Design an enzyme around this catalytic site. Structure first.
Site, PDB file in Angstrom:
ATOM      1  CE  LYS A  44      -3.146   3.311   0.805  1.00  0.00           C
ATOM      2  NZ  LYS A  44      -4.309   3.842   0.004  1.00  0.00           N
ATOM      3  CB  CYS A 131       0.366  12.108  -4.001  1.00  0.00           C
ATOM      4  SG  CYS A 131      -0.047  11.567  -2.317  1.00  0.00           S
TER       5      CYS A 131
END
Ligand SMILES: Cc1cc2nc3c(=O)[nH]c(=O)nc-3n(C[C@H](O)[C@H](O)[C@H](O)COP(=O)(O)O)c2cc1C
Ligand SMILES: Cc1cc2nc3c(=O)[nH]c(=O)nc-3n(C[C@H](O)[C@H](O)[C@H](O)COP(=O)(O)O)c2cc1C
Ligand SMILES: O=C(O)c1[nH]c(=O)[nH]c(=O)c1CCc1cc(C(F)(F)F)cc(C(F)(F)F)c1
Ligand SMILES: O=C(O)c1[nH]c(=O)[nH]c(=O)c1CCc1cc(C(F)(F)F)cc(C(F)(F)F)c1
Lengths: 313, 313
Positions: A44, A131
């Site tokens: 992750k 992001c």
């Protein structure tokens, strides 16, 4: 007849892996992927500090796919690094480790520490360019100067071959620009296309309500909704980055979707939503399905048809 | 119980209309759409001179939707202006006229000539902002300086109320930027969200070929693939443009989908791919399905739930 591949100086039983975020958050998850017949796994996307993420409900799935605004919950970099250096069994399959720092500096701090472990254990970096950076600016890969900045600094800080996870693009000039930027950076050896289709909105008719709580219901889209978008990006970058590998990710439920990703030019094939929905037994099905398709057509290896999608005239 | 409504100073028997590009290119098509139950219709986006479009095959549909790269085939603005001017029966339903010029100057030249006929007959301009300008620069609505320029010049030139057809966005900062731009212009009274999800790629497994001939198989996506994208857009603009209407377009195959578009805040609901596939009878089914969902919930008017989608907490 076989699914084997060697790339980035590693050997892979088959081209399948989880997508970052799915069944890779905890030690339990990673051992589960490791014990699966996946050809690899990815951890992750992590930050420096552990993160709770956003309030639930925050993921939902439906026949055509999924929506998520998780808010990057993760156990923190020290946990994934330690998984890489001390816990993971590389004799089973290779490991990718995904970092998704909230600033160029967070990303630099992590990769500096990742370097020695990468060199010595052979863990492979996937840097997440979806992001957000500063709120009110678009995500990093939709802001080409920010993306430039992030790759110079990470290339500098890490000094080893890494890959990158790209959001989808929808315009030809954007494919051209983004790939020109990636081609500036020799250490970027692979490109993963794609992350979620950004900020869709699922509304439930009976309740007259959105289905996920953060962001007034807005979230990233995976699954059947996004395959064509995922195939276009895989192929756009496969065509414009001849010295890099492309990893496909986007609406894979079936050996047939894996087959198209590969014709489009995919080397590895990631499974997000369908892996969440179905569980890790999916990888045996995807293997037999892709092998069934290959047999029928007389292909013995992936490289006989990788990147070989035909056009009309 | 009826679905009538009133807007932009025109009366509509229901919120349904075709999407630009679908069943609206020839006089035959427009007569068909007019004889339909649609509450309204829109003419094919047009350029000054007629256009053949791209090589066939150029549109394909599949169970989950459609891909196209038509190349803006149309009979040219003289034809549609003349339809608006001498042939359309305004007692039957309102008419919109889409223009999609290849430059701001081409757009300025068409709107000035349109203005008189809008004044005289009440044809409503939908200015198509999902059109490229220059090869190499993104389409217009993905270039906020260019978008501002088209809005400035057209607004100056046309000087009556008009609307715009937007491509989807996928990032929150772009919704904020896009909508801040459209809000600069008080003549823009309706925003149609959305045009095609840009440059997807459908590949056919059996033949290992893309399915449309232009652009190496790359094309605009419609249908079920885009509904949550169209909903997020309708809702994002609805919330950010309180003194405008939003028209929703994208993935309407049923009354239910239409109902989610209205809850998202749509005043008019456009049908493209589903109308291409089923034909103009689709309008009677969509009406009845929507009236049925309304009845079951005890809604008498669209006004009662438009824009009323619930969020969590
Ligand atoms: C619950 C969930 C969490 C995810 N988390 C991440 C993540 O942390 N980092 C990342 O790069 N992508 C993340 N993704 C995106 C997936 O990696 C993948 O790119 C996307 O879901 C599309 O694949 P699919 O169509 O197979 O879902 C996530 C997706 C889901 C559904
Ligand atoms: C064959 C075809 C032609 C189209 N032509 C146009 C056009 O000329 N102008 C325009 O603004 N949109 C055009 N569109 C886009 C539609 O108006 C609509 O935005 C889109 O297809 C999404 O709606 P759907 O999901 O109902 O198909 C076209 C779509 C298709 C499938
Ligand atoms: O954790 C996620 O929301 C997530 N979900 C995805 O489908 N892909 C991702 O790459 C990520 C993590 C990166 C991410 C994305 C977002 C978003 F809201 F812009 F999509 C926000 C954040 C963060 F850090 F803010 F929470 C992280
Ligand atoms: O006629 C179209 O190809 C078309 N298809 C759509 O789905 N939406 C549209 O708005 C249009 C017409 C505008 C348009 C779009 C494109 C594209 F490849 F950028 F999508 C190209 C052209 C043109 F002018 F080059 F033919 C026109």
């Amino acid at each position: 007849m076989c699914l084997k591949l060697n790339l980035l100086d590693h050997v892979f039983a088959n081209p399948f892996m989880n997508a970052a975020g799915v069944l890779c958050s905890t030690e339990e998850d990673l051992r589960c992927m490791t014990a699966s017949s996946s050809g690899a796994l990815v951890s992750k996307s992590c930050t420096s500090a552990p993160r709770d993420g956003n309030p639930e409900p925050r993921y939902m799935a439906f026949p055509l796919g999924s929506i998520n605004s998780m808010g990057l919950p993760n156990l923190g970099f020290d946990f994934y690094l330690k998984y890489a250096s001390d816990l993971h069994d590389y004799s089973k399959k290779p490991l990718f480790l995904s970092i998704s720092g909230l600033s160029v500096e967070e990303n630099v701090a992590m990769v500096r520490r990742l370097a020695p472990v990468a060199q010595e254990k052979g863990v492979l970096l996937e840097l997440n360019l979806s992001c957000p950076n500063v709120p009110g600016k678009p995500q990093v890969a939709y802001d080409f100067e920010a993306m430039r900045t992030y790759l110079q600094q990470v290339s500098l800080a890490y000094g080893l071959p890494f890959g990158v996870k790209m959001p989808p693009y929808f315009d030809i000039a954007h494919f051209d620009t983004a790939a020109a930027v990636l081609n500036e950076f020799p250490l970027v050896k692979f490109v993963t296309c794609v992350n979620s289709v950004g900020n869709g909105l699922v509304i439930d008719a009976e309740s007259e309500s959105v289905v996920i709580k953060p962001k007034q219901g807005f979230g990233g889209l995976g699954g059947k909704y996004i395959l064509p978008t995922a195939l276009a990006n895989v192929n756009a970058f496969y065509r414009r980055c001849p010295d890099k590998l492309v990893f496909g990710c986007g609406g894979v439920y079936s050996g047939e979707d894996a087959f198209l990703h590969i014709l489009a030019g995919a080397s590895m094939v990631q499974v997000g939503t369908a892996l969440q929905e179905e569980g890790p037994g999916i990888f045996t099905r995807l293997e037999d399905e892709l092998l069934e398709i290959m047999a029928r057509k007389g292909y013995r290896t992936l490289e006989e048809f990788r990147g070989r999608v035909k056009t009309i005239e």
